[PDB]
Symmetry: C2
Subunit: 122 residues, 2 copies
């Protein structure tokens, strides 16, 4: 078979109804992603989209939300140790991980309890 | 604040213990992604990694696996039309989505019940 898949366009992360202020304050303010406008048709669904490099993260509203604690997206970060201190400074709780040896990584939870990984190569 | 975040490096998709054969059959054979060897130190954890463009998908083993039927990763596809009919040819069930009119897209479930989305911009 031919090679159709070109990469990850975006990841969708779930959140409850009314999540927007908190989503904006964490993804936008705190970790510093740029919010982007949703397509006109999809606005009526609630939620927020944010840009990270050539990819996006779509925070989507769910009727019966449960956070994703295991499966999760991993974002590549420049200057990870500087970024991490910027998070710690803002009261974000971080969890370091040394299991993968040529990579620096840590985990955080978004305001809704969803697992996020940040990594950079050593 | 400076702009530290560069992109999505990978997505971790959960699966049960013993999933490797079924994961390779679907992610590798069916959808056609290239299997990537895991770091030596991580072998014992089970699971498999597949390449997609400058990104990866990591299938990670979970004893307490719960499939992600709603929140999911979305993969960009060239010639999605033709990709979709290649999946149907192989007996894969596809669920089209027409809500976003600038984009063609559809969902499938992997063998463990996780939702995956495929999309392409319209020309």
């Amino acid at each position: 078979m031919r090679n159709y898949i070109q990469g990850i366009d975006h990841v969708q992360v779930a959140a409850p109804v009314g999540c927007e202020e908190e989503a904006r304050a964490f993804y936008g303010e705190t970790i510093g992603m740029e919010e982007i406008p949703k397509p006109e048709e999809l606005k009526k669904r609630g939620g927020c989209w944010f840009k990270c490099g050539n990819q996006e993260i779509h925070i989507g509203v769910e009727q019966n939300f449960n956070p994703a604690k295991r499966a999760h997206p991993a974002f590549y970060v420049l200057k990870i140790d500087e970024f991490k201190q910027e998070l710690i400074k803002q009261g974000i709780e971080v969890i370091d991980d040394h299991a993968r040896p040529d990579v620096i990584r840590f985990y955080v939870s978004d305001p809704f309890g969803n697992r996020i990984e940040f990594m950079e190569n050593k």
